[PDB]
Each structure stands twice: as structure tokens, then as C-alpha cells.
Symmetry: C2
Subunit: 293 residues, 2 copies
């Protein structure tokens, strides 16, 4: 496996829930970056160097993904709820001495990030969420057209061991098909092949696949209920926020986020779902500008 | 593979789109019985005997399922649309001289049946559907709760080869998990083991699995659009109808049919195997007078 962050250090950070693996580089105000599914920290490799010119950049594997430890799950999928993931990432930031920091997330990592902002807002100076709406909004919109377009939320959420058994025959084919499908061109051309190999090796481990299904189970059940509480109570994030989305992505999104956040700006970018790999210069620039302003 | 139909013949019926396999027994008025997913005609083995006391009973494999031939599909999944399946079964019944008959179906076979009643109501004396609502109604109901409960409607409808590739690694597990999870018991104890082997053997074949996905792609697209036209026109099935459902709906069918009666049966989805006495008794009494 290639080193895609040349000159960045590496840290295995202890927490009460297990170790978090991270690459660490640059100098300046602290900025945590969080990937999602079906990827690892390496998806930030095209934008990290440029962010590292202006910030101390912490590129972490999510609890249970990549090289971070995989805690044993339970009947409510607790450790892979976004509430618990956020708590665990807060502890890992405190081990480095960061109690107030900037945060950007993508896909599941964006879900950890907004949940973090709702539960513990004093932790964040600013927040960016890339190509997502809140988990409550995804589910509230569900109808035949969305059910057919974005099927995997309900598939990976079926009780164990159904999705796990289906995915075990030919795991490479599933992970590569997902990566390609969500891009603008529908192929693997946007990704560095050494980044594709990181994703494929993680996806080849049955234990790593189980974590991803637990993540999506949490997505269908506890995460949804936690969001519902907040929207029914009218709670909005007060942290200044940016919503960036792909014109051809999965997530207008800015109008949805205005219901969830009192100080939000946003823009589309010409891209599929994978903004930091499909549109690196534009994504790096939008983030540097937002976090420096 | 076991003969589960004592005193029934075995027939291959020709049609313009391929052969339909059927077990045929009994005498008297004609009654066609249609299975669904993930099963074959064998799923009527416990109720067909009682029905054959009074009727001439035709127990057919759906187009592409079991031992029926598999017509070539196309980009709109045409031969696995319920409209096309019904036209093909209408042709099969004509090869036997049956142009007006009674019809009961379960799961996919019930969708063929109600679409047959909507398209060609003159073909049917009476109609029974087991544990379904119309395809349009399931889709209209597709919120978070339904997306989770009935996930396979969206998964099996994903463009080829995604579900076919996944089902290929351990098909025995997938079929047995479906059978089990929709029963009251949650295991395979309601089923005869010989019937389970018919279902496993059919599901073990990649070409039979592809047909199943074509059926669900039809269910997501043309079949939905067909139902939508009837709902927008206010069309109602005129044929006398019975809706049976597992306690583990009559109001829904009253919107789709002008002469409908209905009852729950103590059962999961697989009424003719979980609740064979009660299912047979209800069908016999409906179809008699
Ligand atoms: Ca320490
Ligand atoms: Cl979303
Ligand atoms: Cl770019
Ligand atoms: Cl069905
Ligand atoms: Cl019974």
C-alpha cells in the first residue's frame, strides 16, 4: 500500500472505544478531516497538501474503518452511531490537545460531523459537510424514485448476516462498482489507482465489511431517531457552516441545511459524489477560503 | 426431486413465447393456481388435493420460473411484465380449451392474476389473491418503514448485473433466508423439506435467478406504470374476487374491485404451506358458489 501523504506523520491515538489511526501534517489552526463509505482517510490525498500549507491537518480513519480499531457492536449498533463516533473522535482530539477545532467531513464522516455539532457545539470553530443532507432528510424524502436510485441504505441495513453473506462472494466487484457509479463519468477515472487499492484492501476484510453494515444499520435506526428529536424540537446548529455538494452527487441542499443550521453558506461544484478526488482544486480552494475567513 | 402431487399428470403446454410446465389433476370446472417468488408450482402441494376433489386443477410454473421455458428479455423487461405473463398464461389455457376459468395466485402469481383480471376480465369466472396489495399501492406506500421491510423490491430491481453478481456467491443461503424470514415461525419448519429442495434447486441456476430480477425490474417500472393508468382512470376489477391475507387490505382492494370479499388467515406470508387447512377451506368455499 502506497504512502499518499508525503511528509505527513502517522499517529495511532488511544480512546476509551479503541485506537483511531491518523495521518498528521502542516502547522496552524487544527483541522480534522473525516472520510466515509466505501473509503478510508486516503480519499483526502489530493486536497490535504494544499490545506496543510495553512492548517495543522489531522486525516483520521473513522471508528471501525481503515486502520482504526473495530469495537464489538451491539443490538442498537451503538459504537457505529454517529453520536458515539463523534464522542470517540472528541476523545482522540483531546489526546492531541485539541478541544476546539475546525472540521470537514464527507459521506458518513459528514454525518459524524453534523451530529458532533448538534451534541457538542463548543468543540467546533467551523464545520464543512460535503455532498450530504441530514440522515432524517434522506429518510423523510423516501418514495419509489429515491428507493430505486439510492437502494444501499436499505440493503446494508437488513439484519445480519444477510448483507454480509451477499458481499462475501466477490467483494472487489461490489466496492469497485460503487466507487465508479457515484462519480460524474460512472467509471474509476477520477481516482488514483493507489487510492483504489487502499479502498479495495479494506473492503476485502469481512470484519471491515461488518462495520460498514453496522454503520448503515445505525443510519436506519438510532441515527435517524437522534436527528428526529432535534428537528421536532427545532434545534439548529449555531457553528458557522459550509455545505458543498456535487451537481451530479447524491445530496437545493443549501435550502435543506438552512432548516438545520442558523449560519450556513454553500455552493455546488461540477462533480459526482467524490468531491475531493473528482474536483480537488476547487474543493481545496472552497475549504481553505471558508476556514481562513 | 419428490412427486408431491398424488394422482396429477405432468404437462408441457406450448405458447408463442415458450412452454409452460404444469401439474394437472381432478375434474369439473377449471381452476388455475399461480405461485410467486422464490418458489415454484410445488407450493400448492398441500391445498391442490382438496381443490382437486371439486375442480380440474392446473398448477403452473410462471413464465421463466421452475420448469417453464425462459423467453428472452429486453430493455423494458417485457416478457416478465405481469401484462405479458398473463397473455402467455391465457395462451396456455387456450391450448387446453379453457377460455373462461377460476384463478388463484400468491406473491408474483397474484400480480399476474389481478393484471389478467384488469386486462381481460372475460377470461375469469372468479379470482383469489393471497397476501398481496397492487404493485402501485406498495410503491405509493414506500416510506422509510416500507423501504426497510420490503427492501428486495429495490435491490432486485437494480440494473444488471449488480443483484445477479451478489446472489451468485451463496444462493442456497439467500433463498432459505427469504423462505424463513417471511413465515410466522421465522424458520423453515412450516415447509416440507422436499418442497424446500425444489425451491433451492431452481434458485441454484444463474439463468433462473436472472429471470427473478427481470420480474422485479418489471415490478419497479412497466408494471407500476400499467397499474398507474388504471388508478388514474378509476378502473375497477368487475370479476368476483377474494383477498386472503396472513395475520402475520380489504379496504385497499375495494378501491381496485367492485365485488370483493376478504379474510385474515392465521399465518405468515406463505398461506398455502403455513395454513393449508384454513387456506384450502376458504378457496373451496369461494370457488364453489
Ligand atoms: Ca495520552
Ligand atoms: Cl444525503
Ligand atoms: Cl478541480
Ligand atoms: Cl409479491
Ligand atoms: Cl390451517
Amino acid at each position: 500500500l502506497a504512502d499518499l501523504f508525503p511528509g505527513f506523520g502517522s499517529e495511532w491515538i488511544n480512546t476509551s472505544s479503541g485506537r483511531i489511526f491518523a495521518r498528521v501534517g502542516g502547522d496552524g489552526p487544527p483541522l480534522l478531516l473525516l472520510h466515509g463509505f466505501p473509503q478510508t482517510h486516503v480519499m483526502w490525498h489530493r486536497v490535504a497538501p494544499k490545506l496543510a500549507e495553512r492548517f495543522k491537518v489531522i486525516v483520521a480513519d473513522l471508528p471501525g474503518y481503515g486502520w482504526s480499531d473495530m469495537p464489538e457492536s451491539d443490538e442498537q449498533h451503538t459504537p457505529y452511531t454517529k453520536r458515539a463516533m463523534a464522542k470517540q473522535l472528541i476523545e482522540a482530539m483531546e489526546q492531541l490537545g485539541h478541544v476546539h477545532f475546525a472540521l470537514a467531513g464527507h459521506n458518513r464522516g459528514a454525518r459524524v460531523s453534523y451530529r458532533l455539532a448538534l451534541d457538542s457545539p463548543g468543540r467546533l470553530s467551523k464545520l464543512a459537510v460535503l455532498d450530504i443532507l441530514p440522515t432524517y432528510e434522506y429518510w423523510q424524502r423516501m418514495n419509489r424514485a429515491y428507493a430505486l436510485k439510492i437502494y444501499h441504505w436499505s440493503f446494508l441495513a437488513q439484519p445480519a448476516p444477510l448483507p454480509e453473506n451477499l458481499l462475501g462472494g466477490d467483494p472487489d466487484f461490489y466496492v469497485k462498482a460503487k466507487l465508479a457509479s457515484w462519480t460524474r463519468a460512472g467509471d474509476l477515472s477520477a481516482f488514483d489507482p493507489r487510492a483504489v487499492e487502499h479502498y479495495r484492501i479494506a473492503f476485502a476484510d469481512p470484519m471491515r465489511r461488518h462495520v460498514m453494515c453496522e454503520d448503515y444499520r445505525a443510519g436506519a435506526y438510532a441515527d435517524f431517531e437522534h436527528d428526529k428529536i432535534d428537528v421536532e424540537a427545532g434545534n439548529k446548529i449555531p457553528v458557522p457552516m459550509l455545505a458543498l455538494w456535487g451537481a451530479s452527487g447524491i445530496a437545493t441542499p443549501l435550502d435543506v441545511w438552512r432548516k438545520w443550521a442558523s449560519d450556513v453558506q454553500g455552493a455546488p461544484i461540477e462533480s459526482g459524489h467524490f468531491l475531493p478526488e473528482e474536483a480537488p482544486d476547487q474543493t481545496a480552494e472552497a475549504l481553505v477560503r471558508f476556514f481562513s475567513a
